[PDB]
């Protein structure tokens, strides 16, 4: 129909603006912060994708959980997650954020950050390289590109 075409083009517009202007808040927990700092370094350069370097946690669009989540900091992670405006996304970077990793059987480690926050992209590695993290960010952009918020709103 006509309105279906309108909500299709508006979904394309707002998904374009949301994937082409991702603002990340990176939790620099552990060694994966070093490789995020390489994904911001000149070779890979997140900023040329519109992915800025270190937005504040209240204007950021995606939370990159880069490192080991312990039991002592998991409520702070959930607090920063709850304080993000929607649409908010979570990239889990590295094995400790994904599933506990090398500290999986530890007494003081949350076995994956997905016990705490809903995770969109799981980026595997110890650490995953800056190229692999940039792959995960572009896969997040492709996930945003196929969102159907207004088409489902029009069909409800």
């Amino acid at each position: 129909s006509r309105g279906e075409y309108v909500v299709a083009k508006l979904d394309d517009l707002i998904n374009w603006a949301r994937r082409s202007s991702l603002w990340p808040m990176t939790f620099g927990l552990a060694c994966c912060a070093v490789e995020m700092m390489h994904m911001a370094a000149p070779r890979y350069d997140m900023d040329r994708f519109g992915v800025v370097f270190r937005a504040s946690p209240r204007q950021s669009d995606v939370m990159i959980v880069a490192g080991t989540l312990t039991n002592k900091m998991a409520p702070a992670l959930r607090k920063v997650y709850d304080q993000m405006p929607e649409p908010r996304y979570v990239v889990s970077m590295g094995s400790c954020a994904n599933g506990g990793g090398y500290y999986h059987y530890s007494y003081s480690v949350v076995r994956g950050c997905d016990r705490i926050v809903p995770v969109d992209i799981y980026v595997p590695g110890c650490p995953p390289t800056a190229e692999a993290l940039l792959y995960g960010i572009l896969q997040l952009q492709k996930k945003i590109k196929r969102e159907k918020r207004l088409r489902i709103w029009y069909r409800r």
Binding site: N98, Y105, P124, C126, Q139
Partner: protein, 176 residues
């Protein structure tokens, strides 16, 4: 065998005093900093065009795991569980039995890719080059359990990447 950083007593003749005061009043080192930043403005940047251009890797690179095969179709894993005894993360779960022709073969070969520390002790502990840690690093998933590989996923990674894995092992095996 040692040196003194910042132990320079400055000169007090009118030449050096007026040099330091001209540096204070005319901002010489600030223009030196602006000159260095302006020098990098006209350099060619170091940015590669990902995904079209790729970062350089070596044949030793430790990425996604793969169970290999001999050059007849027979799989190399003879169910010996050295890769899970050596595994620092206990990411490898192995269960075995004799199959229908009497070969010592696995039925369960799981790797939890979210426990794995990607250190490659499994490929260097493997006596028959069955488990390798191949060159794929672009395998991010959208769900946690898609990073929980069974034997089918790992043998499919072997069949998927063997044309590359065999050449990397061919380039590196005389260092091993």
């Amino acid at each position: 065998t040692y040196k003194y950083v910042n132990l320079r007593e400055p000169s007090m003749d009118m030449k050096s005093v007026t040099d330091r005061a001209a540096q204070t009043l005319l901002w010489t080192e600030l223009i030196r900093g602006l000159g260095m930043t302006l020098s990098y403005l006209f350099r060619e940047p170091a940015t590669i065009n990902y995904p079209f251009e790729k970062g350089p890797l070596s044949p030793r690179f430790r990425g996604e795991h793969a169970l290999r095969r001999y050059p007849s179709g027979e799989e190399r894993c003879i169910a010996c569980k050295l890769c899970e005894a050596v595994c620092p993360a206990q990411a490898i779960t192995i269960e075995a039995e004799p199959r229908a022709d009497g070969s010592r073969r696995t039925t369960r070969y799981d790797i939890d890719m979210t426990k794995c520390i990607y250190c490659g002790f499994c490929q260097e502990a493997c006596p028959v080059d069955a488990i390798v840690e191949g060159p794929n690093f672009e395998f991010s998933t959208e769900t946690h359990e898609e990073l929980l590989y069974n034997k089918e996923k790992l043998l499919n990674n072997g069949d998927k990447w063997e044309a590359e894995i065999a050449a990397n092992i061919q380039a590196d095996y005389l260092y091993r």
